[PDB]
From Swiss-Prot, chains A, B:
Signal peptide (from-to): none
Superkingdom field: Eukaryota
Reported tissue expression: Higher expression in adult small intestine and to a much lesser extent in fetal kidney.
UniProt GO molecular function: fatty acid binding; molecular carrier activity; retinal binding; retinoid binding; retinol binding
Residues reported to bind all-trans-retinol: 40, 114
Organism from which the protein derives: Homo sapiens
Entry similarity comment: Belongs to the calycin superfamily. Fatty-acid binding protein (FABP) family.
Name the UniProt record assigns to this protein: Retinol-binding protein 2
Organism ancestry: Eukaryota, Metazoa, Chordata, Craniata, Vertebrata
């Protein structure tokens, strides 16, 4: 038969990494590719083809949670799962209306600052000379 | 203000990759983490804080689509966004009931074969001596 019309869900996929290596895809892109499911929607009219393929990434911990409880001024041990899984000794204090934390440990100049402005929560995470700024909106 | 109580949806995330490198997070982990948004639920009771942060994947990163329109026997230009981002000249012919394609370009023996067997779509992708065999079920 020649009629390839339909919606097709991938059922089996073998030597997908061998083929991608032959095309020089890097290790990381392959590791993301083999975690994708594929749907193919084929519209065929004689010898005219419309082939639409959808790759969906499926990562475990698609909804990962990280919980930290602390009191201002009370040093606590933090295990930075969700990031680098290191042990730091963390201490949170107020500097004005800015919540400031120092994470003493292997990394020097590691810590963060958290504050409110308007309807938004600002967070800046520091490690050495690298600052990451994140902004959150109130729901 | 000091009141950080609320549910906070991430709106922006700047130099997150720079920060993760400073923490020695590996490249592939960084590449996936930068695709995530997070919701932060802060329950603040004086100077005691419970911070539950949830990481989920963005929505535009939930799936990539790759669209190909072609007519049997009419060479067409393909840019393989979903794989190796190369330019090939593609030509599809029938060989029996098998839709056979040759992708002329940098890679030798690059092409694919598609055919129906039962209610199943078979796809074999070749590059050199590497063959990827895929089977699709009709949805």
């Amino acid at each position: 038969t020649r009629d390839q019309n339909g919606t097709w869900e991938m059922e089996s996929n073998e030597n997908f990494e061998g083929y991608m290596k032959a095309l020089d895809i890097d290790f990381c892109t392959r590791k993301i590719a083999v975690r994708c499911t594929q749907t193919k929607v084929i519209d065929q009219d004689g010898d005219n083809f419309k082939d639409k393929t959808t790759s969906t990434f499926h990562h475990h911990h698609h909804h990962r949670n990280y919980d930290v409880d602390f009191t201002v001024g009370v040093e606590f041990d933090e295990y930075t799962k969700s990031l680098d899984n290191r042990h730091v000794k963390a201490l949170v204090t107020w500097e004005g209306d800015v919540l400031v934390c120092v994470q003493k440990g292997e990394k020097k100049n590691r810590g963060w600052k958290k504050w409110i402005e308007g309807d938004k929560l600002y967070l800046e995470l520091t490690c050495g000379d690298q600052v990451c700024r994140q902004v959150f909106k109130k729901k």
